[PDB]
Design a protein around this ligand. Structure first.
Ligand SMILES: CCCCCCCCCCCCCCCCCC(=O)OC[C@H](COP(=O)([O-])OCC(O)COP(=O)([O-])OC[C@@H](COC(=O)CCCCCCCCCCCCCCCCC)OC(=O)CCCCCCCCCCCCCCCCC)OC(=O)CCCCCCCCCCCCCCCCC
Ligand SMILES: CCCCCCCCCCCCCCCCCC(=O)OC[C@H](COP(=O)([O-])OCC(O)COP(=O)([O-])OC[C@@H](COC(=O)CCCCCCCCCCCCCCCCC)OC(=O)CCCCCCCCCCCCCCCCC)OC(=O)CCCCCCCCCCCCCCCCC
Ligand SMILES: CCCCCCCCCCCCCCCCC[C@@H](O)O[C@H](CO[C@H](O)CCCCCCCCCCCCCCC)COP(=O)(O)OCC[N+](C)(C)C
Ligand SMILES: CCCCCCCC/C=C\CCCCCCCC(=O)OC[C@H](COP(=O)(O)OCCN)OC(=O)CCCCCCC/C=C\CCCCCCCC
Ligand SMILES: CCCCCCCC/C=C\CCCCCCCC(=O)OC[C@H](COP(=O)(O)OCCN)OC(=O)CCCCCCC/C=C\CCCCCCCC
Ligand SMILES: CCCCCCCC/C=C\CCCCCCCC(=O)OC[C@H](COP(=O)(O)OCCN)OC(=O)CCCCCCC/C=C\CCCCCCCC
Ligand SMILES: CCCCCCCC/C=C\CCCCCCCC(=O)O[C@H](COC(=O)CCCCCCC/C=C/CCCCCCCC)COP(=O)(O)OCCN
Lengths: 178, 603, 156, 459, 128
């Protein structure tokens, strides 16, 4: 999620992803813990038979018939964690996520309550404001000519600098705002 | 004078006071849910009096209090019907709703908009009470649409979730498909019987034709989620557990069946519609049970069980036993609501975990939920002298001892077996094995709200069947004589299902793994009906709506025909007429030609 | 802030205007493919794959996570049809044809066997129910001034 | 009747002489007072009509339309007061003058005891609307829209005038009362067929008919908020009023000639409801919904039964109010967003809950939820069509299903989901917008208590 | 061996089952690198416009304007009368009208004939 994607997936990444999917779907098939442990160790042994293989064409032939076999026996109703992109509580709390700038439109009678919070917010806004001009310059001087090649942002290199484009990553509402 | 009317209107009237006070100050405090729960409990204990009067005397009423618009010879008025059905269904619904709000007090403890949730629940209850007591078709339609809109609002309670909005729109779509038949029935009844009142409709239809009954059957299939329009009920489990326990399990989803109960004088005079109803109920209950016996989400299993029970109710209606179907509604509300409450308690205890693959040993980890779920499953499958027996046993006997179709009876028996199968599946996969939940145990039941709400419906699910059956007057001829083997058909079928499903489930412990068969894939994917029917038609509609309706005709051809052709023709004629180089020779020659034509043509 | 040249135009026929259009829509020339040049007014708009937005990666950090869309990337012509609230093209564990055949066969078998059961009903070894007063003539329809044919029931 | 016309005329001098910062207040107050005065016309009789004089008369079909027309002006002023803030006093007074002139023309049109006077005012209503659309419009296409909104209308209306004068040469009077009392059957002839067409298509073009509905999306999209309100609420009902007034002399030729228009409306309601499903513009979607509802009204008028007429009147009133509310909500979104696209701004219920409630109520009342008067009119028309032929119920039910689908689609796309991240200029809704929504919605839920007030003369 | 999955329009081919993915080549790698470079440039522009504290408005999305304009305003100028378009327009704009006209006309002639013969039983039919 946080880490920037790569231009492509290597063979080891693909085999690791297949291993993850196969073990998860095997756990979905094998409800009980001991049965899952036995069959997962059996699957690990089946996977590590060809670990030391060197031929790239034969390696590509491998993992492909494995993906086909996985698709044939992929447990059409697999287990999904509640907050996962397929879970029952994937986006339950997205209706309670309110942006930070909404507080700028509060009535003064509402800002009369919670004065310390708005003072700290003022310090945060000043820090963002002073910081922003420098961040743009860093991005301008650090970005390779011809535009970025990978959507990875550099860290702050000086003392008083801050990571470029940090405001909307630091100011996420919450995971469970209410 | 005659307190029956005053009490039976006062219950519904006092059901609406918290809606009035929703704009007051109490709505902004945390005592609002307690206010609503107390109001509902008082409404139930107040409606217990008309039930007592009816049981004593058999007293029935029609209260046509307010006069709405009068349209020539057709008069529309605010009329409430207080027959056996209304005065019996109101207390049960109020009791279930009281239990549901008491449970939601604890289940929605951390929800910021809990007062709005309770207001929505009360509004749904008000709309359902409007639907049940309606004496004319317009008020019944008002309730029909109110319950649907409240279901739409409550399914999409978490509006930040895409799937909740999708499920709400699905439910609205299927209910409008039923609305088509409902409106057809209304139009036919007004055109031919000249009234929407129940009395005039019953009087002027000695032998009811096919079309109004087919419209009523379509509306009932739409609202009760029969086989043709089933998937919206399984998909409605996206809403909060109290919503699934109140609306989509016990009160709202029976409404369509109730409709067919209300028009039973016209139902018995038609044979084709009865056969269609019986076949639809049989196929619905079979298909829903078969889909249920292989699900992993507990809420989905309970919803499919509810749909199977609705199919059984439709079969009972089809075999000319409306009162028995009403009794089944009354018992099913009790035990299915309590079952859903147990499911919600388990769900909350395991940190919002719904799949049964992560639920292990709970027989000792949580005992009260265990005993409540066991009692509910026993009542649902049918244990003699329990609340489910007095209904389902008579259902089976009436099906066996009457002139029906063989296939419908076979599917009813197989559906009973599959009901036992998924009940034992739930119990085995959720209560018997070793624990499989995450290590951080947060199991807790020490809360009086949940315990009291569950135990009230427990006492109901144990005693209410006997009390109600022995209290109401006899409304049909009993099957006093029976073959000894055919007397025990339901019991042996249920026991066989229990034993076979337990034996099949016990083989999961075996250290052997085999790929699934085609039948398992068909049953797990809901007969593949949700895939095809939610991908093939919709696309083929939406694409057309942009290709032919929007672009081809509206944007191109309708534009080409009238405006663009006129513009092109006028531009061409203007260019031709105005393009004169200014040479008087050509104009003078044209004038000479015109003079010659005028001299040679106009004389 | 949008200029005239950054709006869709007619169908591109030469490679130069094809490259210009591909640059306009922020995509490679190789990836660019306009709709076939027929009467319908697609003009020069990329024919993106007909894949739905449900099966886009749900773990990537999209600028619009609900719609699963990025800011400047081209939008499919039928985007409103694929919004995760409508028709989705996600692959299924079983093939489309197999599911179609299974559903159709189940429905057809159910209908045929329901018709068969209608042809062959089930009943008990009993005669019709007997009713006392002229088969309840007076209480079913009425008409007391017609004197229906008297029916007498059997004692056995 | 002059007790309503004269204050509307005095609204002009008052606006011009009003202080440079007090035009809106005076206009709103006096328009509301004039609406209160016009409320008295609802007291109708079961007898003929309220014949005030030789020039103006009232009826229980004209009375609800007149009340709605008088009520719309304060709402139009309240909606227009927002986007005209940076505008010079003379031109704001000109805008108010155009609104007042349109209201005066509509008020005189709805009484119109004589058909030539009715035609004159019915075509005089065109000029202020065209000026409003082509002057105070945002996009460059407004001019084109104006042209369309003009010529279509005239393309239907110029033959009507000829027919009208021809009738006066044969009948001898174009007064509605004499025309009703001295009506004679039309022989099935080619000349009578063409006279029927000349009398009918002028009103069919403004409803609009499915074939002739092209001008409406353009005119509604490019017009300002007040123009959209007046077009959707009142200007579409002129065709229905004219048809109900003029179909008396067209019998019995109406039975044969109604078939093409009945088929066109019954299929175009489905076509426009399906078009609403795939729409990237809020105003266009509302316009197509208006087209569908007016197609249903056309079906009702062509069926020509008492229940048809009652349902038609109720549906016109309800649709006017509902469409005005929907356009107002869309304009409130646009004033913050400046894009007028459904998919751009999302999840507004999180930021503006009360406006989300207003959106929900508007969508529900457009969905024809009972016991709203929308449902009353729809059900009456459906029952009359079923009596006309039992097969219409399929198309009617399909239309209801698609209507519910696109209404909830409009609600969910804009209110539900996750908010757009980069949009930060979404300020809290003002008191003016909320008051506008409340003043739009409360009359509907009050009229559902007294339906007979809007059911027309055949009640 | 196992039964093969057959792709369809509404059930597309899985990502891990595409034969094209396993045919890796330098040209394909370069194409993917260029695609990710384009996406990275667009994302960088969007974030630069997004995190700016001075901005107090929506960020204009030229892709969205292009989509809306091509959907609505670019249809007719690119339209050409073609046998496909002519036939499809004629069908979808004329056929349903005549079909429904025939259906309703047949129904109404049947009803009128039944009324004329008097065998319709219109008792209690008062409201119409
Ligand atoms: C039911 C009995 C009622 C008796 C009490 C009297 C109540 C009078 C209310 C009249 C209508 C309200 C005015 C409309 C604008 C809303 C005002 C507002 O902004 O709320 C701020 C206020 C404060 O909220 P907040 O926390 O500050 O803001 C948070 C957000 O706004 C977030 O907002 P939210 O999430 O809280 O949502 C607001 C809420 C409420 O907002 C609404 O949506 C109101 C919409 C109601 C109807 C929708 C249109 C459909 C057409 C129906 C027309 C019937 C009208 C009858 C005559 C009405 C007279 C004016 O929405 C809903 O709950 C959904 C309602 C859908 C119900 C569908 C069933 C319709 C038919 C029901 C039967 C009616 C006839 C019965 C005949 C047989 C029995 C005798 O909220 C309320 O006041 C809630 C109102 C109470 C609920 C009313 C819903 C049912 C009433 C139906 C009409 C009246 C029936 C008359 C007798 C019935 C017996
Ligand atoms: C007159 C005397 C009366 C007495 C008669 C005799 C008494 C009873 C005799 C017993 C007869 C059979 C009972 C055993 C049932 C089978 C259970 C079993 O072994 O399942 C495992 C086995 C496969 O397991 P798996 O794939 O390895 O799953 C992996 C794990 O187990 C995954 O496990 P999991 O943890 O995920 O979940 C486990 C779950 C998942 O298991 C499943 O996958 C369920 C799927 C099969 C079970 C469903 C059986 C219900 C049959 C209703 C069908 C109605 C007609 C449908 C028409 C379809 C048309 C295509 O299994 C269960 O929980 C229990 C399943 C249901 C068994 C208990 C109730 C059934 C007994 C009642 C049947 C008749 C008695 C009625 C009594 C009334 C007196 C008349 O299932 C089968 O092999 C199928 C056996 C029978 C299926 C028949 C349908 C075949 C349709 C093909 C085409 C046919 C021609 C159509 C032509 C149409 C052309 C137009
Ligand atoms: C484009 C979007 C919609 C715009 C509005 C469209 C609706 C307007 C259509 C007007 C309705 C049809 C016009 C005439 C209908 C009369 C009935 C006729 O069709 O039936 C037969 C008529 O026969 C033939 O139809 C003869 C006429 C054929 C010539 C008409 C051209 C046909 C297609 C042209 C359509 C173009 C219309 C739009 C022009 C701009 C019956 O034969 P007959 O019993 O002997 O005649 C009875 C009438 N009498 C008694 C007066 C003599
Ligand atoms: C409340 C506060 C006051 C409490 C003290 C007063 C107690 C009651 C005494 C009031 C006097 C009785 C009264 O109200 O008069 C009846 C009066 C109408 O007069 P009628 O002549 O009978 O009928 C109209 C035709 N002329 O009835 C009322 O208006 C009050 C009660 C009516 C029912 C309540 C309204 C609830 C339903 C709202 C409408 C719902 C939509 C339409 C219904 C659709 C049904 C198909
Ligand atoms: C007998 C003769 C009948 C004459 C009927 C006249 C119909 C009224 C419309 C006349 C418009 C003719 C002018 C015209 O179209 O010019 C093309 C013109 C080019 O634009 P320009 O601004 O002039 O210049 C741009 C380049 N710098 O195209 C347009 O813009 C037209 C846009 C608006 C079209 C108006 C709508 C007309 C169609 C509506 C129905 C009327 C049809 C006629 C009657 C139908 C038969 C009953
Ligand atoms: C006749 C009706 C014709 C069908 C109308 C098509 C309308 C198309 C526009 C709808 C908008 C698109 C939409 O709703 O999205 C599709 C949406 C999403 O699918 P999910 O399964 O929820 O996926 C969620 C998991 N990711 O699914 C739907 O809701 C669409 C439902 C379409 C159902 C059409 C088939 C119904 C046919 C019923 C016939 C049987 C009737 C029964 C007879 C009873 C007689 C007694
Ligand atoms: C949005 C665009 C819609 C355009 C509306 C056009 C439809 C109206 C019909 C065409 C105009 C006819 C106007 C006639 C006015 C009524 C007068 C009348 O009917 O009197 C007839 C006159 O009837 C006519 O002359 C009509 C002839 C038509 C001439 C103009 C043709 C215009 C185009 C016709 C084809 C289109 C037909 C359908 C158009 C529908 C619109 C799409 C009797 O004549 P007499 O000589 O007095 O009889 C003595 C013997 N008994």
């Amino acid at each position: 999620a946080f880490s920037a994607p790569a231009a492509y997936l290597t063979h080891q990444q693909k085999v690791l992803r297949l291993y993850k999917r196969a073990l998860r779907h095997l756990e979905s098939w094998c409800v009980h813990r001991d049965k899952y442990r036995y069959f997962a160790c059996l699957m690990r042994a089946r996977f590590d038979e060809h670990k030391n293989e060197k031929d790239m064409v034969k390696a590509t032939q491998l993992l492909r018939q494995a993906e086909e076999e996985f698709w044939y026996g992929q447990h059409p109703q697999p287990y999904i964690f509640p907050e996962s992109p397929g879970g029952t509580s994937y986006e339950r709390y997205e209706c309670y996520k309110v942006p930070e700038w909404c507080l700028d439109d509060w009535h003064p009678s509402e800002k009369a309550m919670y004065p310390d919070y708005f003072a700290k917010r003022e310090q945060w806004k000043r820090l963002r404001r002073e910081s922003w001009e420098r961040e743009v310059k860093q991005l301008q001087e650090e970005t390779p000519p011809g535009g970025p090649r990978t959507e990875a942002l550099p860290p702050a290199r000086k003392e008083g600098d801050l990571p470029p484009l940090w405001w909307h990553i630091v100011t996420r509402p919450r995971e469970r705002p209410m | 004078m005659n307190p029956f009317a005053s009490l039976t209107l006062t219950t519904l009237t006092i059901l609406t006071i918290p809606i009035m006070m929703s704009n007051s100050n109490i709505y902004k405090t945390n005592l609002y849910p307690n206010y609503v729960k107390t109001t509902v409990s008082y409404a139930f204990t107040l409606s217990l009096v008309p039930l007592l009067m009816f049981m004593h005397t058999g007293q029935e009423m029609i209260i046509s209090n307010w006069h709405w618009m009068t349209l020539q010879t057709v008069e529309l008025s605010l009329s409430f019907k207080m027959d056996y059905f209304s005065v019996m269904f109101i207390p049960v619904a109020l009791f279930v709703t009281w239990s549901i709000m008491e449970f939601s007090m604890w289940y929605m403890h951390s929800d910021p908009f809990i007062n709005r949730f309770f207001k929505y629940l009360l509004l749904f209850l008000i709309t359902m009470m409007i639907l049940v007591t309606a004496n004319n078709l317009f008020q019944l339609f008002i309730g029909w649409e109110g319950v649907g809109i409240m279901s739409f609002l409550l399914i999409g309670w978490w509006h930040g979730r895409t799937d909740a909005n999708t499920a709400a729109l699905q439910a609205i779509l299927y209910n409008r498909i039923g609305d088509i038949g409902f409106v057809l029935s209304m139009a036919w009844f007004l055109t031919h019987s000249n009234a929407w009142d129940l009395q005039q409709i019953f009087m002027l239809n000695n032998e009811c034709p096919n079309m109004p009954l087919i419209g009523l059957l379509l509306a009932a299939a739409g609202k009760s989620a029969q086989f043709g329009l089933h998937p919206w009920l399984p998909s409605a489990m996206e809403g909060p557990t109290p919503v699934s326990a109140l609306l989509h399990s016990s009160t709202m989803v029976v409404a369509g069946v109730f409709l067919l109960i209300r028009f039973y004088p016209l139902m018995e005079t038609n044979k084709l519609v009865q056969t269609m109803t019986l076949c639809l109920g049989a196929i619905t209950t079979l298909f829903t049970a078969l889909c249920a016996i292989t699900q992993n989400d507990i809420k989905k299993i309970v919803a499919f069980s509810t749909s199977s029970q609705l199919g059984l109710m439709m079969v009972t209606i089809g075999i000319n036993q409306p009162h028995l179907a009403f009794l089944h509604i009354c018992m099913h509300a009790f035990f299915k609501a309590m079952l859903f409450m147990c499911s919600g308690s388990i769900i909350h205890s395991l940190n919002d975990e719904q799949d049964i693959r992560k639920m292990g040993g709970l027989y000792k980890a949580m005992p009260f939920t265990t005993t409540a779920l066991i009692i509910g499953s026993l009542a649902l499958t049918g244990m003699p002298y329990l609340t489910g027996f007095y209904s389902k046993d008579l259902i089976i006997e009436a099906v066996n001892m009457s002139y029906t179709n063989a296939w419908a009876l076979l599917m009813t028996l197989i559906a009973t077996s599959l009901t036992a199968a998924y009940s034992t599946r739930i119990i085995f996969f959720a209560f018997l094995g070793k624990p499989r939940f995450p290590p951080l145990v947060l199991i807790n039941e020490n809360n009086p709200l949940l315990i009291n709400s569950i135990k009230r419906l427990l006492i109901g699910s144990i005693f209410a069947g006997f009390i109600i059956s022995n209290n109401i007057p006899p409304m049909t001829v009993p099957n006093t004589t029976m073959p000894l083997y055919m007397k025990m058909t339901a019991l042996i079928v249920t026991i066989m299902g229990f034993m076979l499903a337990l034996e099949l489930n016990n083989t999961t412990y075996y250290l052997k793994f085999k790929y699934p068969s085609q039948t398992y894939k068909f049953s797990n994917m809901l007969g593949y009906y949700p895939s095809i029917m939610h991908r093939l038609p919709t696309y083929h509609n939406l694409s057309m709506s942009q290709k032919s309706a929007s672009s081809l005709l509206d944007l191109i051809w309708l534009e080409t025909i009238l405006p663009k052709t006129t513009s092109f023709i006028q531009m061409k004629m203007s260019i031709m007429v105005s393009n004169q180089k200014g040479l008087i020779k050509l104009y003078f020659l044209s004038f000479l030609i015109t003079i010659m034509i005028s001299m040679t043509l106009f004389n | 802030h949008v200029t005239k040249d950054m709006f869709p135009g007619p169908y591109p026929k030469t490679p130069e205007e094809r490259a210009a259009a591909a640059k306009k829509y922020n995509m490679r020339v190789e990836d660019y493919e306009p709709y076939p040049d027929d009467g319908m007014g697609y003009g020069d708009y990329p024919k993106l794959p007909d894949r739905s937005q449900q099966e886009r990666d749900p773990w990537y950090d999209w600028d619009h996570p609900d719609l699963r869309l990025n800011w400047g990337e081209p939008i499919h012509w039928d985007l409103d049809m694929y919004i995760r609230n409508r028709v989705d093209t996600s692959p299924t564990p079983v093939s489309w044809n197999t599911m179609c055949k299974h559903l159709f066969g189940f429905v057809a078998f159910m209908l045929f066997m329901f018709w068969v059961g209608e042809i062959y009903p089930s009943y008990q070894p009993v005669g019709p129910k007997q009713y006392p007063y002229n088969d309840l003539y007076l209480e079913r329809g009425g008409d007391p001034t017609k004197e229906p044919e008297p029916v007498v029931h059997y004692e056995i | 009747m002059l007790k309503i016309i004269i204050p509307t005329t005095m609204l002009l001098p008052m606006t011009w002489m009003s202080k440079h910062n007090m035009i809106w207040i005076n206009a709103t107050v006096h328009s509301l007072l004039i609406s209160l005065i016009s409320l008295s016309l609802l007291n109708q009789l079961g007898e003929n009509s309220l014949n005030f004089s030789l020039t103006f008369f009232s009826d229980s079909l004209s009375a609800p339309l007149l009340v709605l027309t008088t009520w719309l002006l304060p709402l139009m002023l309240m909606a227009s007061q927002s986007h005209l803030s940076k505008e010079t006093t003379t031109r704001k007074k000109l805008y108010i003058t155009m609104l007042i002139l349109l209201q005066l023309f509509l008020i005189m049109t709805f009484t119109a005891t004589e058909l030539i006077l009715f035609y004159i005012l019915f075509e005089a209503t065109l000029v202020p609307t065209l000026i409003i659309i082509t002057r105070w419009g945002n996009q460059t296409e407004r001019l084109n829209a104006g042209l369309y909104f003009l010529f279509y209308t005239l393309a239907g209306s110029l033959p009507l005038l000829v027919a009208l004068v021809y009738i006066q040469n044969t009948t001898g009077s174009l007064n509605f009362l004499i025309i009703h009392y001295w009506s004679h059957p039309l022989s099935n002839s080619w000349s009578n067929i063409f006279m029927w067409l000349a009398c009918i298509m002028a009103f069919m073009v403004k409803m609009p008919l499915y074939g002739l509905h092209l001008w409406l999306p353009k005119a509604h999209v490019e017009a300002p908020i007040a123009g959209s309100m007046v077009l959707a609420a009142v200007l579409l009902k002129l065709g229905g009023y004219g048809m109900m007034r003029i179909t008396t002399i067209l019998n019995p030729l109406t039975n044969y000639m109604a078939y093409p228009f009945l088929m066109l409306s019954m299929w175009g309601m489905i076509m426009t409801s399906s078009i609403c499903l795939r729409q990237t513009d809020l105003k266009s979607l509302i316009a197509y919904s208006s087209v569908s509802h007016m197609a249903l009204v056309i079906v009702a008028i062509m069926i020509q039964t008492p229940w048809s007429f009652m349902g038609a009147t109720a549906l016109m009133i309800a649709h006017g109010l509902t469409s005005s509310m929907l356009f107002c909500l869309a304009n409130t979104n646009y004033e913050r967003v400046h894009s007028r696209t459904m998919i751009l701004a999302r999840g507004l219920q999180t930021l503006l809950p009360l406006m989300a409630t207003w959106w929900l109520v508007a969508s529900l009342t457009n969905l024809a939820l009972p016991p709203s008067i929308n449902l009353i009119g729809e059900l009456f028309i459906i029952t009359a069509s079923f009596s006309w032929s039992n097969i219409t119920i399929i198309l009617m039910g399909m239309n209801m299903m698609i209507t519910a689908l696109y209404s909830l689609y409009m609600l969910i796309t804009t209110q539900r989901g996750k908010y757009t991240h980069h949009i930060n200029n979404i300020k809290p809704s003002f008191t003016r917008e909320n008051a506008l929504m409340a003043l739009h919605i409360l009359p509907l839920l009050l009229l559902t208590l007294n339906p007979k007030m809007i059911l027309g003369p055949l009640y | 061996s196992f039964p093969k999955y057959k792709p369809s329009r509404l059930a597309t081919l899985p990502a891990t089952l595409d034969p094209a993915e396993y045919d890796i080549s330098p040209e394909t790698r370069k194409a993917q690198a260029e695609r990710l470079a384009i996406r990275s440039r667009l994302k960088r522009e969007y974030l630069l416009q997004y995190n700016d504290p001075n901005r107090l408005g929506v960020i204009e999305d030229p892709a969205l304007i292009r989509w809306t304009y091509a959907r609505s305003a670019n249809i007719y100028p690119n339209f050409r009368p073609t046998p496909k378009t002519s036939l499809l327009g004629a069908l979808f704009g004329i056929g349903p009208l005549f079909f429904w006209y025939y259906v309703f006309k047949t129904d109404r002639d049947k009803k009128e004939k039944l009324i004329q013969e008097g065998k319709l039983d219109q008792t209690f039919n008062i409201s119409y």
